[PDB]
Design an enzyme around this catalytic site. Structure first.
Site, mmCIF file in Angstrom:
data_model
loop_
_atom_site.group_PDB
_atom_site.id
_atom_site.type_symbol
_atom_site.label_atom_id
_atom_site.label_comp_id
_atom_site.label_asym_id
_atom_site.label_seq_id
_atom_site.Cartn_x
_atom_site.Cartn_y
_atom_site.Cartn_z
ATOM 1 N N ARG B 241 0.867 -1.170 0.000
ATOM 2 C CA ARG B 241 0.000 0.000 0.000
ATOM 3 C C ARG B 241 0.897 1.210 0.000
ATOM 4 N NH1 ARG B 241 -3.354 -2.636 -1.267
ATOM 5 N NH2 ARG B 241 -5.590 -2.726 -0.755
ATOM 6 N N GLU B 270 -3.926 7.990 -5.274
ATOM 7 C CA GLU B 270 -4.102 7.274 -6.535
ATOM 8 C C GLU B 270 -5.347 7.726 -7.313
ATOM 9 O OE1 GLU B 270 -4.100 3.178 -5.410
ATOM 10 O OE2 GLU B 270 -1.924 3.076 -5.100
ATOM 11 N N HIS B 288 -0.712 0.528 -9.878
ATOM 12 C CA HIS B 288 -1.384 -0.366 -8.940
ATOM 13 C C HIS B 288 -2.031 -1.507 -9.706
ATOM 14 C CE1 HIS B 288 -3.898 -0.490 -4.955
ATOM 15 N NE2 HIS B 288 -3.443 -1.679 -5.305
ATOM 16 N N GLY B 290 -0.960 -4.792 -9.239
ATOM 17 C CA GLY B 290 -0.552 -6.006 -8.564
ATOM 18 C C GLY B 290 -1.317 -7.271 -8.896
HETATM 19 N N1 LIG Z 1 -0.554 -3.963 -5.242
HETATM 20 C C1 LIG Z 1 -1.563 -4.808 -5.438
HETATM 21 O O1 LIG Z 1 -2.182 -4.900 -6.498
HETATM 22 C C2 LIG Z 1 -1.950 -5.663 -4.230
HETATM 23 C C3 LIG Z 1 -2.703 -6.822 -4.409
HETATM 24 C C4 LIG Z 1 -3.097 -7.594 -3.323
HETATM 25 C C5 LIG Z 1 -2.737 -7.210 -2.034
HETATM 26 N N2 LIG Z 1 -1.980 -6.043 -1.845
HETATM 27 C C6 LIG Z 1 -1.591 -5.611 -0.483
HETATM 28 O O2 LIG Z 1 -0.971 -6.722 0.193
HETATM 29 C C7 LIG Z 1 -1.498 -6.737 1.529
HETATM 30 C C8 LIG Z 1 -1.266 -8.087 2.214
HETATM 31 O O3 LIG Z 1 -1.899 -9.162 1.512
HETATM 32 P P1 LIG Z 1 -1.873 -10.660 2.107
HETATM 33 O O4 LIG Z 1 -2.742 -11.500 1.252
HETATM 34 O O5 LIG Z 1 -0.464 -11.078 2.290
HETATM 35 O O6 LIG Z 1 -2.582 -10.484 3.543
HETATM 36 P P2 LIG Z 1 -2.083 -11.287 4.847
HETATM 37 O O7 LIG Z 1 -1.486 -12.575 4.428
HETATM 38 O O8 LIG Z 1 -3.223 -11.330 5.792
HETATM 39 O O9 LIG Z 1 -0.957 -10.314 5.466
HETATM 40 C C9 LIG Z 1 0.439 -10.573 5.289
HETATM 41 C C10 LIG Z 1 1.235 -10.361 6.581
HETATM 42 O O10 LIG Z 1 1.306 -8.996 7.029
HETATM 43 C C11 LIG Z 1 1.645 -9.142 8.417
HETATM 44 N N3 LIG Z 1 1.597 -7.868 9.170
HETATM 45 C C12 LIG Z 1 0.521 -7.110 9.382
HETATM 46 N N4 LIG Z 1 0.857 -6.036 10.092
HETATM 47 C C13 LIG Z 1 2.165 -6.106 10.338
HETATM 48 C C14 LIG Z 1 3.070 -5.302 11.006
HETATM 49 N N5 LIG Z 1 2.671 -4.167 11.578
HETATM 50 N N6 LIG Z 1 4.360 -5.673 11.066
HETATM 51 C C15 LIG Z 1 4.776 -6.794 10.500
HETATM 52 N N7 LIG Z 1 3.936 -7.583 9.852
HETATM 53 C C16 LIG Z 1 2.636 -7.276 9.750
HETATM 54 C C17 LIG Z 1 0.530 -10.091 8.848
HETATM 55 O O11 LIG Z 1 0.828 -10.623 10.143
HETATM 56 P P3 LIG Z 1 -0.207 -11.627 10.862
HETATM 57 O O12 LIG Z 1 0.162 -13.095 10.312
HETATM 58 O O13 LIG Z 1 -0.145 -11.544 12.339
HETATM 59 O O14 LIG Z 1 -1.666 -11.269 10.282
HETATM 60 C C18 LIG Z 1 0.688 -11.162 7.766
HETATM 61 O O15 LIG Z 1 1.664 -12.126 8.173
HETATM 62 C C19 LIG Z 1 -2.970 -6.392 1.306
HETATM 63 O O16 LIG Z 1 -3.585 -5.926 2.510
HETATM 64 C C20 LIG Z 1 -2.816 -5.213 0.347
HETATM 65 O O17 LIG Z 1 -2.564 -3.997 1.055
HETATM 66 C C21 LIG Z 1 -1.585 -5.270 -2.946
#
Ligand SMILES: NC(=O)c1ccc[n+]([C@@H]2O[C@H](COP(=O)([O-])OP(=O)(O)OC[C@H]3O[C@@H](n4cnc5c(N)ncnc54)[C@H](OP(=O)(O)O)[C@@H]3O)[C@@H](O)[C@H]2O)c1
Ligand SMILES: NC(=O)c1ccc[n+]([C@@H]2O[C@H](COP(=O)([O-])OP(=O)(O)OC[C@H]3O[C@@H](n4cnc5c(N)ncnc54)[C@H](OP(=O)(O)O)[C@@H]3O)[C@@H](O)[C@H]2O)c1
Lengths: 333, 333
Positions: B241, B270, B288, B290
């Site tokens: 993000r 954005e 954006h 992704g």
């Molecule tokens: N650019 C794009 O097109 C695109 C596409 C999809 C997603 N994204 C971004 O990617 C993010 C994550 O996606 P995901 O599927 O990986 O979700 P996720 O698996 O639920 O989150 C990934 C990790 O982030 C960790 N985390 C959260 N807060 C943290 C902190 N303060 N310090 C360290 N680690 C932390 C979480 O810890 P925990 O295991 O404790 O929950 C989890 O292990 C989405 O929320 C979105 O913002 C971007």
């Protein structure tokens, strides 16, 4: 440092230095390639040469150089050198394999992902300001690209570079198909690459990457006909040699949707310009930078210095291309 | 098809259809985000809703929404929905996890590689005819980028995507390091990832990739302090993000030269425009995109409907973001 050696371009100092102590070194300062004329002049008293893939070391060059006994190509390919002629004249020809493998492999995958996802195009959309201008931020259907993970990659030429590309392909959990001159059971099992006839590979592959040297047998290996065998959604990556692909055919396959896109680092003529090619969006281009990595160029400069020095010491160069020349003469000055 | 559902934007046909026979669908038809008002108006008699990231779904929206019982986010991140209030109002909120995991991981690498190897700048040099114009074919010191194979990748956030990025890295024989809210033994062993203090991860990584959600805790996690901690030769990749990074500090860290480059897919605003950044050659930008892969936007579409079609049947949505709301009211209309 009695022996004289001419280096056709400004290579890493680490290399020149190594030669400074065993040879009497001269280096071409200008950035643009050395003029064909000026080159046939310099090679008059030299004992060894360090050439770029840009210099055409043909018979003429050999003739205008009576004391030349070894040519160190600052590159892994050698299609720019008249090997056979050199072997007859008892001249050793070396190249720089391995040291640039990962650099080239990394770039191929760079071109694969970038081409399959519109990185280069999107960047223009963001940079120029058109993204802001249009007002829309994120749309469900914009910049759709091709998945890479779990898909099928077809490597043509499973040698040093090709194998490297297969390893990276394993990270993406892709299915690996390859077409090369021989089957190496050991390599196949390790990388889990299945051998398939070029026609099948070009038919089944989602990504086709060329990792072969330029030879009479690979010239235009990718022609109009071969391009048709390919899926309409497949992509072609070329970090090998331009002439391995019939550029005219590619432009046609693209402009007519025979394939999805192409990522090219090498071209039939370098430098290169082609209005119809360069006009396409499903095409990613790069100025032959396959090995343009700090480590690669550094290790290339060192390897080059190793060969000549081994030669001086009457040793069989570490990376000698024409081993047959061993019987036509002995290494030394 | 009694229930009414308003879909904020045009998404894959596959979804519109699955719902077509369970809901009374209406699809906002403009490419640009729906204006605040028009949205407030439309959400009056809606029993469900399909929103995009850019949609600021706060309490104001929940007010004009007397029949709203579930909000399906066409995205995995929900930093655009006031979950707390959603729960408080008994409104279920779902997202699209996993289906887009590989699409995003792919792009993360597309950026890592394109930034590390001047792919975007190379395509320009070549495409604009500037390469031909300059007349130099190949030089030993042109476009030298950073090696990737064998290097250290530091993944901030080891979730579904961050792990997918680790697997990808295994393919380049990278030394995997990660910082995250919690150590996961099962996962560390599998991916051979080493947990490390954010401070250590930033001092030891050649590549730092952000994969965390946007929270009060992650806002500007990467700032002037942290940037300085990174290697002078490191590269920052952000597909998380925009707000997780302090744009202004990065610009400086780039110009100043605290780090080597950055590949950004997301920004603080954005669409985004920043003259200072956009003029840097060590920055690769994408609008954006992704999860912009055919299969992703496709699967995401089927999940949105899947969640809505199960809610209608009085069942807990397969990917319910707020489990706390199951108690505040049962599933159904
Ligand atoms: N650019 C794009 O097109 C695109 C596409 C999809 C997603 N994204 C971004 O990617 C993010 C994550 O996606 P995901 O599927 O990986 O979700 P996720 O698996 O639920 O989150 C990934 C990790 O982030 C960790 N985390 C959260 N807060 C943290 C902190 N303060 N310090 C360290 N680690 C932390 C979480 O810890 P925990 O295991 O404790 O929950 C989890 O292990 C989405 O929320 C979105 O913002 C971007
Ligand atoms: N873009 C760049 O900057 C860059 C950088 C490095 C290299 N390159 C180019 O790409 C090439 C990479 O080669 P390498 O370093 O991997 O050397 P290599 O190990 O010799 O690889 C060559 C492979 O091609 C196979 N092959 C040769 N002719 C063939 C044919 N007619 N049909 C099918 N397969 C054939 C060889 O088979 P065998 O085992 O039978 O010989 C071998 O498997 C270089 O020679 C050069 O042309 C470009």
């Amino acid at each position: 440092m009695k022996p004289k050696v001419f280096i056709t371009r400004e290579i890493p100092e680490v290399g020149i230095k190594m030669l400074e102590d065993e040879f009497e070194v001269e280096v071409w300062g200008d950035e643009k390639e050395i003029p064909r004329e000026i080159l046939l002049k310099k090679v008059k008293e030299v004992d060894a040469l360090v050439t770029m893939l840009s210099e055409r070391i043909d018979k003429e060059v050999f003739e205008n150089a009576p004391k030349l006994r070894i040519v160190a190509n600052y590159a892994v390919g050698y299609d720019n050198i008249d090997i056979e002629e050199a072997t007859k004249r008892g001249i050793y020809v070396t190249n720089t394999p391995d040291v640039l493998t990962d650099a080239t492999a990394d770039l191929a995958f760079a071109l694969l992902l970038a081409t399959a996802r519109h990185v280069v195009k999107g960047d223009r959309f963001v940079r120029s300001g058109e993204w802001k201008k249009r007002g829309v931020a994120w749309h469900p259907k914009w910049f759709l690209g091709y998945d890479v993970y779990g898909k099928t990659i077809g490597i043509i030429g499973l040698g040093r570079i090709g194998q490297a590309i297969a390893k990276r392909a394993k990270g993406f959990n892709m299915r690996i198909l390859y077409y090369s001159r021989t089957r190496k059971e050991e390599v196949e099992r390790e990388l889990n690459a299945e051998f398939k006839p070029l026609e099948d590979l070009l038919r089944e592959s989602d990504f086709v990457v060329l990792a072969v040297p330029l030879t009479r047998e690979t010239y235009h290996l990718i022609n109009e006909e071969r391009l048709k065998l390919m899926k309409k959604t497949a992509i072609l990556i070329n970090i090998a040699r331009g002439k391995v692909v019939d550029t005219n055919a590619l432009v046609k396959a693209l402009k007519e949707g025979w394939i999805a896109g192409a990522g090219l680092d090498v071209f039939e003529e370098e430098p290169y310009y082609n209005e119809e090619l360069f006009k396409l969006d499903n095409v990613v281009l790069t100025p032959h930078i396959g090995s343009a990595s700090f480590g690669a160029r550094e290790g290339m400069a060192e390897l080059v210095a190793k060969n000549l020095i081994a030669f001086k010491r009457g040793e069989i160069p570490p990376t000698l291309v024409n081993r047959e020349v061993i019987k036509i003469r002995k290494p030394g000055f």
